Amino acid sequence: VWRNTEDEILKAAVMKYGKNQWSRIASLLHRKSAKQCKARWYEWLDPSIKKTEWSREEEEKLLHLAKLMPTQWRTIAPIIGRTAAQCLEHYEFLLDKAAPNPETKPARPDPIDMDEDELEMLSEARARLANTQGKKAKRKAREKQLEEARRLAALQKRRELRAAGIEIQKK
Amino acid sequence: EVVLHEDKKYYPTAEEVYGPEVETIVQEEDTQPLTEPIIKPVK
Amino acid sequence: AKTVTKQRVESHFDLELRAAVMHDILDMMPEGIKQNKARTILQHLSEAWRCWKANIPWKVPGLPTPIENMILRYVKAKADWWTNTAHYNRERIRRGATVDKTVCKKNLGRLTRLYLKAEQERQHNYLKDGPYITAEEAVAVYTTTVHWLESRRFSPIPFPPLSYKHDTKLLILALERLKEAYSVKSRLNQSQREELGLIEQAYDNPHEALSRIKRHLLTQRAFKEVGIEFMDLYSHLVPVYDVEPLEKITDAYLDQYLWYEADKRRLFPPWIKPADTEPPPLLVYKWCQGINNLQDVWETSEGECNVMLESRFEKMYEKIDLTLLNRLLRLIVDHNIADYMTAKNNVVINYKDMNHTNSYGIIRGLQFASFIVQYYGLVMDLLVLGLHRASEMAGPPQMPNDFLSFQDIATEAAHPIRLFCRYIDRIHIFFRFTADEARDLIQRYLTEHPDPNNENIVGYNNKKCWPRDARMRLMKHDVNLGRAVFWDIKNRLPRSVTTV
Amino acid sequence: QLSKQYSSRDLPSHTKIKYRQTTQDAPEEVRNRDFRRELEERERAAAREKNRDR
Amino acid sequence: VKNKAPAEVQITAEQLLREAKERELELLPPPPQQ
Amino acid sequence: WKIPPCISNWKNAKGYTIPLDKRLAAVHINENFAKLAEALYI
Amino acid sequence: TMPKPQWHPPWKLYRVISGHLGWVRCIAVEPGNQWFVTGSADRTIKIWDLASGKLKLSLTGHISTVRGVIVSTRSPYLFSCGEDKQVKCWDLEYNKVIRHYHGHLSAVYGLDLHPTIDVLVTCSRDSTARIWDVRTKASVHTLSGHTNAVATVRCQAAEPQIITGSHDTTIRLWDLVAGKTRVTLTNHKKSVRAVVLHPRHYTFASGSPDNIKQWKFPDGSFIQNLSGHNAIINTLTVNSDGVLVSGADNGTMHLWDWRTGYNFQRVHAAVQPGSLDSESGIFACAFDQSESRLLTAEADKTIKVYREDDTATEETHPVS
């Protein structure tokens, strides 16, 4: 199942990495694979998916299509602009008023005390999202300030060495 | 009057784009095999 | 100044292409004076190319037209180069010239992308130019099938009952078949690991499994997305479909149940022949042995003529229509299972980063696809033979016939079609004509396709493997009879359903 | 500063220049020729042959 | 001991983005003036 | 002559956050389906 | 104003050849006028008959775009030049490469032949030209001094013997023996991709998206402008009768009068069926040897042949 913490990580992860690197994102999450992340995005968390009420024109067109092209919900869904799970639930519901897969379901909210792993993930997700500098661009940034020890130490020690009275030449 | 995707004519044909009198050659593979010199020598 | 050899062909193509682009407009159709941003137009160029490769429609909101035309022109340049290289390497791989192992993989990836681009275009054209099958071909097909099934006294398949006796036998068979893939117990992956987990826990607790299975078959009509990839056989490729585990188990059980029941109620008449009764060499023997046991078959006194035709339905898996297929399945099974089966072929197909939706053909990597292919082929056997001759061949429903036998000799000789075999989508027919039936056929052929210039002898294809003393001898009566027979058969099939 | 290195491909090869002989197309003949009329001649001939084509 | 019970506000994304923004991970301390 | 910047879905060389909306932006049905389906029901 | 321009008849398209699998980038005519040769971005060199338009032969040696071909008037040789940095000499009595000139450091954009001595000149993107010895494949001079790709080169027997136009918007007139630039002409604001020499007048013209300009040898004194064609100009080609063809890169082709600079026709041809409309463009044009036909090599993989119109008169098509 899907927990609000996780899909809130997924919104940010998609916001950062892009809409085609599902294995990276899947790695941000513990206990998720890239297939499930991609499914959850294309079924519920996409901002272009509508969760509203069916306008009367929507419902008439839905029944119209479901008669023109029966059981082809992936074909029908984009013709009216909602996901196939929504169209399928609402069509059976219309038929009955007149008479799993956890990607589709909403997210169980956050608990009062978040289970510790729920917390460390957030910190580490925060960790990953902030590391813009090229992981090596981290290292060499460290190195630029690293060697400043080398020169700064040497000079004072060189000053002191030549101050002690010995005029060393390196070469 | 349904056109099987096997036909699906895009792309107006040449005579319609160029005109009734402009000639149109389409030359895939050539005549005159490669061994035949373009400039023949003397003998 | 080192030459451009074979490892630097691609990197050099891109060097020179983007040098050209930088010359081209970003310095010779400017008047974006300040800083003409050419380093960013090159970014657009690379992204337009990736979008071409992914089959995405690329349109940037406010981007001057001269630039857009420049980019479209150069992406067409690179696309021509790319696919011409694919054509060339494919011919080398097919005939056998290179063994390089990076070219084999590069080329399989190129042709996978080319296939999926053509395929998304074919599905879009379906949904745009509408069902290719008119409402009068489809109604003839539907009514002919109802007449068949009613004359046979078929007994439709019911939804698998609650306390069916055989549910565990059908489940054990399904799960053994699914295990048979990972016999090796290889390095497999996460996803096969997960499948093996599901299979084992269903092998331990077989009633939560079957409860789930029937719940699925009853309520589910929108499924996950399928993966595709190609198996490279060096002279053609084979598509290989990758479905998810939960549904693979539900489909395997549905498959077993349908084939079991179909075989008990006798759906498939004896000519639909990858059958469980003999291996293919025994089919060849029974065919040779049935031809020879026809009545007065080798006699030529009165000018009779035997014709053996063999063909292929030329793409039946690809022009199935899921609406018509739904209705044709409903005549056979419960509407619940029919709806499951036809709502399952309509899924999203995904390769590396290309995605589309199946709406027209059939996914053969499903587990009941055998049943769909053979039932649809049954409908087409009926269109080719006619209900009367199909009822002569299949015998009366109380006393069915064997593979190539008839009830008596009277019926067998009452018609030119003496034998008929149909492998999955392959057709073999054997006719025996009298001189008047043959002459009549040739007349009606020549009336509509008149060949006064005697080039019918030319298109005829023979088998250049036996010596000429054993090949076919092309006299005009003979090649004309051949063309007439073929012309007559390819006229019984609407070209929007299948061809020949 | 001239090197003594050397190359397999800089050995002498094709050391004589062919000149266009008397009949091939020497600059004398093309200096002479009348080209427009010759061209229209072969053009008419080709149209004749291809109407014989059909 | 764990008590599962609906939390109060939420852990919506912008919060992750703002906290990572304020993690400043390695901007860099300035090269020391001497 | 202003050139919009590219935000790709494949390359994020410098690791930059872009909101979903701007990340995002950068069907026909014939009328013979009705005649076919209704002819089948009849 | 001007005296008034000579009346030239207008030209009409009459043939469309299509057999190439990439843009067609260069075109040339044999000395004796029987066949012409095209080189394309599908790395072949096709040889077509000039009367019938039939394809005689296809030569495939290059590794990338062939960007220039030429046929030598003194020897049975065809010299081709590609983007693979290689320059080739095909011998046309065996149809096989016999000689290759090595040393350029990037794609070679064009090439011309000296009319009396046996040398070659090639221009490339490393922003140099080279004077090759046809017979010993040795580079006798590297004409350097431009500061960007050298788009085009033309050579002549008179003096100065080499004119190069480059992408850094400059023209240079070089001396062959000394090997250095005499004159530098900086009148153009945009890349000079086209240069042509009048056959019988000791003058020359140079094309650029700004406007075509005319110059007068041997030290390049300005003469006049030719304006109106606002397009990246890929070619210029002059008839012996003073017709000057200016072929652009969006497909449009203007025909001018050389002497007064009066644009007497504008052709806007159509793209081959399966083409986009962003793929109309002219890369090379060549007059026949009789100077009656005008062949053009286009970015929609066709070769279009124009002939003069014989049924028009000064009063049907007056000169403005």
PDB file of N, CA, C and O in Angstrom, chain E residues 2-30:
ATOM      1  N   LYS E   2       4.402   1.888  20.041  1.00  0.00           N
ATOM      2  CA  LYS E   2       3.932   2.596  18.860  1.00  0.00           C
ATOM      3  C   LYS E   2       2.433   2.846  18.976  1.00  0.00           C
ATOM      4  O   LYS E   2       1.684   1.972  19.421  1.00  0.00           O
ATOM      5  N   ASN E   3       2.003   4.050  18.611  1.00  0.00           N
ATOM      6  CA  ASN E   3       0.583   4.379  18.520  1.00  0.00           C
ATOM      7  C   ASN E   3       0.284   4.882  17.115  1.00  0.00           C
ATOM      8  O   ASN E   3       0.637   6.017  16.772  1.00  0.00           O
ATOM      9  N   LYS E   4      -0.376   4.052  16.310  1.00  0.00           N
ATOM     10  CA  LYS E   4      -0.813   4.479  14.987  1.00  0.00           C
ATOM     11  C   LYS E   4      -2.116   5.263  15.113  1.00  0.00           C
ATOM     12  O   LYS E   4      -3.120   4.742  15.611  1.00  0.00           O
ATOM     13  N   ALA E   5      -2.095   6.517  14.671  1.00  0.00           N
ATOM     14  CA  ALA E   5      -3.241   7.409  14.795  1.00  0.00           C
ATOM     15  C   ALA E   5      -3.041   8.639  13.920  1.00  0.00           C
ATOM     16  O   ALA E   5      -1.943   9.208  13.906  1.00  0.00           O
ATOM     17  N   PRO E   6      -4.088   9.107  13.225  1.00  0.00           N
ATOM     18  CA  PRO E   6      -3.914  10.168  12.220  1.00  0.00           C
ATOM     19  C   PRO E   6      -3.176  11.394  12.722  1.00  0.00           C
ATOM     20  O   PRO E   6      -3.585  12.019  13.703  1.00  0.00           O
ATOM     21  N   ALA E   7      -2.089  11.742  12.041  1.00  0.00           N
ATOM     22  CA  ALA E   7      -1.273  12.878  12.429  1.00  0.00           C
ATOM     23  C   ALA E   7      -2.044  14.185  12.300  1.00  0.00           C
ATOM     24  O   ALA E   7      -3.203  14.236  11.872  1.00  0.00           O
ATOM     25  N   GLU E   8      -1.361  15.259  12.688  1.00  0.00           N
ATOM     26  CA  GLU E   8      -1.979  16.571  12.800  1.00  0.00           C
ATOM     27  C   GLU E   8      -1.918  17.353  11.493  1.00  0.00           C
ATOM     28  O   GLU E   8      -2.963  17.624  10.893  1.00  0.00           O
ATOM     29  N   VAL E   9      -0.723  17.713  11.003  1.00  0.00           N
ATOM     30  CA  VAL E   9      -0.736  18.647   9.877  1.00  0.00           C
ATOM     31  C   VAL E   9      -0.545  17.981   8.504  1.00  0.00           C
ATOM     32  O   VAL E   9      -1.534  17.827   7.779  1.00  0.00           O
ATOM     33  N   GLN E  10       0.701  17.634   8.114  1.00  0.00           N
ATOM     34  CA  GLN E  10       1.123  16.612   7.135  1.00  0.00           C
ATOM     35  C   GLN E  10       2.608  16.790   6.797  1.00  0.00           C
ATOM     36  O   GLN E  10       3.254  17.704   7.319  1.00  0.00           O
ATOM     37  N   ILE E  11       3.153  15.956   5.912  1.00  0.00           N
ATOM     38  CA  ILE E  11       4.558  16.067   5.510  1.00  0.00           C
ATOM     39  C   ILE E  11       4.644  16.381   4.019  1.00  0.00           C
ATOM     40  O   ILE E  11       5.453  15.804   3.290  1.00  0.00           O
ATOM     41  N   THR E  12       3.757  17.246   3.540  1.00  0.00           N
ATOM     42  CA  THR E  12       3.707  17.650   2.132  1.00  0.00           C
ATOM     43  C   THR E  12       5.048  18.066   1.526  1.00  0.00           C
ATOM     44  O   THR E  12       5.965  18.460   2.247  1.00  0.00           O
ATOM     45  N   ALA E  13       5.161  17.981   0.196  1.00  0.00           N
ATOM     46  CA  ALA E  13       6.452  18.000  -0.495  1.00  0.00           C
ATOM     47  C   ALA E  13       7.240  19.281  -0.260  1.00  0.00           C
ATOM     48  O   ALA E  13       8.441  19.239   0.034  1.00  0.00           O
ATOM     49  N   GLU E  14       6.604  20.431  -0.489  1.00  0.00           N
ATOM     50  CA  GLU E  14       7.259  21.727  -0.339  1.00  0.00           C
ATOM     51  C   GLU E  14       8.084  21.780   0.936  1.00  0.00           C
ATOM     52  O   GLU E  14       9.160  22.374   0.957  1.00  0.00           O
ATOM     53  N   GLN E  15       7.646  21.023   1.929  1.00  0.00           N
ATOM     54  CA  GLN E  15       8.386  21.000   3.196  1.00  0.00           C
ATOM     55  C   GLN E  15       9.683  20.268   2.904  1.00  0.00           C
ATOM     56  O   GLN E  15      10.718  20.796   3.314  1.00  0.00           O
ATOM     57  N   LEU E  16       9.626  19.127   2.217  1.00  0.00           N
ATOM     58  CA  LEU E  16      10.919  18.490   1.911  1.00  0.00           C
ATOM     59  C   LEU E  16      11.777  19.438   1.090  1.00  0.00           C
ATOM     60  O   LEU E  16      12.957  19.590   1.421  1.00  0.00           O
ATOM     61  N   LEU E  17      11.194  20.092   0.096  1.00  0.00           N
ATOM     62  CA  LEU E  17      12.061  20.956  -0.731  1.00  0.00           C
ATOM     63  C   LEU E  17      12.632  22.083   0.124  1.00  0.00           C
ATOM     64  O   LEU E  17      13.852  22.260   0.107  1.00  0.00           O
ATOM     65  N   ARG E  18      11.810  22.725   0.949  1.00  0.00           N
ATOM     66  CA  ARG E  18      12.379  23.814   1.778  1.00  0.00           C
ATOM     67  C   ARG E  18      13.420  23.240   2.738  1.00  0.00           C
ATOM     68  O   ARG E  18      14.446  23.867   2.885  1.00  0.00           O
ATOM     69  N   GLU E  19      13.183  22.096   3.368  1.00  0.00           N
ATOM     70  CA  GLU E  19      14.248  21.659   4.303  1.00  0.00           C
ATOM     71  C   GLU E  19      15.546  21.347   3.566  1.00  0.00           C
ATOM     72  O   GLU E  19      16.606  21.632   4.115  1.00  0.00           O
ATOM     73  N   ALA E  20      15.471  20.727   2.387  1.00  0.00           N
ATOM     74  CA  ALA E  20      16.721  20.412   1.657  1.00  0.00           C
ATOM     75  C   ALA E  20      17.402  21.730   1.274  1.00  0.00           C
ATOM     76  O   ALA E  20      18.623  21.857   1.482  1.00  0.00           O
ATOM     77  N   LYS E  21      16.608  22.727   0.870  1.00  0.00           N
ATOM     78  CA  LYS E  21      17.124  24.069   0.523  1.00  0.00           C
ATOM     79  C   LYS E  21      17.853  24.617   1.749  1.00  0.00           C
ATOM     80  O   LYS E  21      18.960  25.113   1.577  1.00  0.00           O
ATOM     81  N   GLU E  22      17.284  24.478   2.946  1.00  0.00           N
ATOM     82  CA  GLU E  22      17.967  24.981   4.163  1.00  0.00           C
ATOM     83  C   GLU E  22      19.005  23.988   4.716  1.00  0.00           C
ATOM     84  O   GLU E  22      19.593  24.304   5.762  1.00  0.00           O
ATOM     85  N   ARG E  23      19.203  22.824   4.083  1.00  0.00           N
ATOM     86  CA  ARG E  23      20.327  21.988   4.470  1.00  0.00           C
ATOM     87  C   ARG E  23      21.646  22.493   3.907  1.00  0.00           C
ATOM     88  O   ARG E  23      22.699  22.073   4.398  1.00  0.00           O
ATOM     89  N   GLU E  24      21.618  23.377   2.908  1.00  0.00           N
ATOM     90  CA  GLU E  24      22.791  24.106   2.444  1.00  0.00           C
ATOM     91  C   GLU E  24      23.969  23.191   2.149  1.00  0.00           C
ATOM     92  O   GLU E  24      25.120  23.636   2.266  1.00  0.00           O
ATOM     93  N   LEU E  25      23.713  21.947   1.732  1.00  0.00           N
ATOM     94  CA  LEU E  25      24.561  20.797   2.038  1.00  0.00           C
ATOM     95  C   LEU E  25      26.047  21.123   2.023  1.00  0.00           C
ATOM     96  O   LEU E  25      26.714  21.036   3.059  1.00  0.00           O
ATOM     97  N   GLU E  26      26.565  21.552   0.877  1.00  0.00           N
ATOM     98  CA  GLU E  26      27.957  21.984   0.766  1.00  0.00           C
ATOM     99  C   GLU E  26      27.943  23.237  -0.103  1.00  0.00           C
ATOM    100  O   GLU E  26      28.206  23.158  -1.305  1.00  0.00           O
ATOM    101  N   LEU E  27      27.575  24.393   0.464  1.00  0.00           N
ATOM    102  CA  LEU E  27      27.692  25.569  -0.381  1.00  0.00           C
ATOM    103  C   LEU E  27      29.173  25.841  -0.621  1.00  0.00           C
ATOM    104  O   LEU E  27      29.701  25.494  -1.681  1.00  0.00           O
ATOM    105  N   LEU E  28      29.828  26.494   0.353  1.00  0.00           N
ATOM    106  CA  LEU E  28      31.169  26.264   0.886  1.00  0.00           C
ATOM    107  C   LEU E  28      31.481  27.403   1.851  1.00  0.00           C
ATOM    108  O   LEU E  28      31.028  28.535   1.623  1.00  0.00           O
ATOM    109  N   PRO E  29      32.191  27.160   2.953  1.00  0.00           N
ATOM    110  CA  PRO E  29      32.730  28.281   3.723  1.00  0.00           C
ATOM    111  C   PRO E  29      33.732  29.046   2.883  1.00  0.00           C
ATOM    112  O   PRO E  29      34.437  28.462   2.039  1.00  0.00           O
ATOM    113  N   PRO E  30      33.818  30.365   3.052  1.00  0.00           N
ATOM    114  CA  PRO E  30      34.625  31.164   2.133  1.00  0.00           C
ATOM    115  C   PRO E  30      36.100  30.871   2.323  1.00  0.00           C
ATOM    116  O   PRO E  30      36.539  30.504   3.426  1.00  0.00           O
TER     117      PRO E  30
END
